[PDB]
């Protein structure tokens, strides 16, 4: 037998953050956001305690998709009815709803799980620079 591995439990302390998503791309931003939310980079990562930090993403509509994807790759959403496919294009997503784009691109990178739906709510994606979350005193770091 052996010494039991150490595992923090309800010993969580989470600090907010700010990243200005000015000219980043979608997916490269999304993996960094997903890891920051899960606390995958924490030195003491307990796989079942939501040991990860909060996150606020600013200037969502300025994010960019490489290549001609803006006219060729579609995002779908289906109601449970028939003929309910709503099919929108990257150019239309970067204009009509941009925060929903980053939100969905982040959520899919989390595991099918019971904290995933509780992790994803720690991502606040404002479309423009201004916000009402200055009260929480976030730090600020570039490209994460």
């Amino acid at each position: 037998k052996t010494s039991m591995l150490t595992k923090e439990q309800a010993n969580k302390r989470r600090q907010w953050y700010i990243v200005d998503a000015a000219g980043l791309v979608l997916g490269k931003l999304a993996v960094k956001a997903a890891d920051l939310i899960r606390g995958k980079n924490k030195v003491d990562f307990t796989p079942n305690q939501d040991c990860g930090d909060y996150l606020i993403i600013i200037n969502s509509d300025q994010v960019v998709l490489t290549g001609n994807k803006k006219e060729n790759e579609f995002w779908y959403h289906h109601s449970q009815y028939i003929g309910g496919i709503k099919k929108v294009s990257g150019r239309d997503m970067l204009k009509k709803q941009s925060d929903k784009l980053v939100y969905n691109a982040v959520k899919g990178m989390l595991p099918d799980n019971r904290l995933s739906r509780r992790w994803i709510t720690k991502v606040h994606v404002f479309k423009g620079d201004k916000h009402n979350m200055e009260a929480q005193k976030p730090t600020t770091l570039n490209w994460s």
């Binding site: 109601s79 449970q80 009815y81 028939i82």
Partner: protein, 229 residues
């Protein structure tokens, strides 16, 4: 746009004769002067609308939070408050009558809570057809057809969301558009609308400026009698 609106109580239905040699059915709507109870501006509240209070009641027959709201806002107490989107050209604390909103013969639309028709079956509800009665067609012959979508795991194996089966019908809001206004009566605070208005005799009836034909008016006169003896 510059949507205009007013409320009343539908009092019944009759007919009146016009020039152009035509008989015109009519609904009669009792419209007590209303009272703007709040105005929402675009910048302040992210949209625009006007909140109207009506069906004045005694202060006793009124809940305390509402009567407090009325006393603080300097109004007459009213049983009902509801609001109209995109009504702009009005201020606070003002009485509004239908004469001040609609031309003599122009186009309005009417919303009203329809007539509650009970738990009704599919064939009256969705205008379905009735299975034949001759040749002995078996006792379930008043049904919604076959609800089938696919037999066997490959095809569909369920009933489709938003099917058409029996249920509750009536007592739901509906609206008839492009119904012209015939005339008014300032003595009784009463208005005349063409056509047939949804809702039972005595319900609450909202009139708005028709979206299909916003400003369109075509005048229609009456048919004063000239036969006496």
């Amino acid at each position: 746009m510059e949507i205009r609106g007013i409320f009343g109580v539908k009092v019944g239905m009759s007919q009146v004769f016009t020039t152009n040699n035509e008989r015109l059915p009519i609904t009669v709507i009792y419209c007590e002067p209303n009272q703007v109870a709040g105005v929402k501006t675009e910048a302040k509240d992210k949209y625009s609308a006007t909140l109207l209070s009506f069906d004045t009641v005694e202060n006793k027959k009124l809940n305390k939070p509402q009567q407090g709201f009325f006393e603080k806002n300097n109004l007459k107490p009213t049983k009902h408050l509801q609001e109209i989107r995109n009504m702009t050209g009005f201020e606070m604390g003002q009485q509004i009558t239908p004469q001040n909103l609609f031309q003599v013969g122009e186009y309005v639309d009417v919303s009203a809570i329809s007539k509650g028709r009970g738990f009704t079956g599919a064939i009256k509800r969705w205008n379905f057809k009735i299975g034949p009665l001759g040749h002995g067609a078996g006792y379930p012959h008043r049904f919604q057809g076959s609800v089938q979508a696919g037999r066997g795991g490959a095809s569909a194996q369920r009933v489709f969301k938003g099917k058409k089966m029996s249920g509750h019908y009536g007592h739901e809001k509906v609206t008839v558009q492009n119904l012209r206004i015939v005339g008014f009566d300032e003595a009784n605070m009463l208005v005349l609308v063409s056509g047939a208005i949804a809702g039972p005799e005595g319900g609450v009836v909202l009139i708005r400026t028709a979206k299909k034909k916003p400003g369109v008016v075509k005048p229609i006169e009456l048919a004063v009698q000239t036969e006496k003896a």
